[PDB]
Amino acid sequence: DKIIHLTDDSFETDVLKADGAILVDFWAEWCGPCKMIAPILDEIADEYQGKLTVAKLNIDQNPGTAPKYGIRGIPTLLLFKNGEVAATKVGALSKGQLKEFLDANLA
Template sequence: MNNTKIITINDNNFEKLITQEKKLLIIDFWAEWCNPCKILSPILEEIAVEYQDKLTIAKINIDQNPNTAPKYSIRGIPALLFFKDSNLLMTKIGSLSKVQLKEILDKHLIVS
């Protein structure tokens, strides 16, 4: 993940990122053992490149960062949280196809 546009965050800098990010922010809650997370990961990397001027994607490993997921009532992964101007716009639990994710993004980016 060296040349990726996706940033890695943790419990300590999660809130700071939400409050400081001006673009649409997608946060991916994931874990190493989660197969749907592994399927979603390359899709997120493609989206991060295609939409780099419009959004920021961050990943948080729930095993290494146990405090953030419960604050957002996340009980299943992968879980994508969409933030804009510090506000949670929506939560999407489970894996998505690239087409499904682009539909969500296009809807929210037009509104934003």
């Protein structure tokens, strides 16, 4: 609803040429902790309305993008600000932990 479902070809417009912050989630369907954080990202998309957009890139359906950011372990959350990565988070985390990651790095 508020989340951008990204693709390899839409990555530049959606993330790189966006005028503000984008929390990108690199994930896969077989990844248990990815699925664990997905309902949390829904909550974040809603709560951070006007501060950032949440965007998801499935690394199997869109295989091209993740090598460009050195992604290995998933889920990987990259906070982009105006096309540049500001903050990196690897592995699963709680809602309360994500908030702290966001609040600290959004300043």
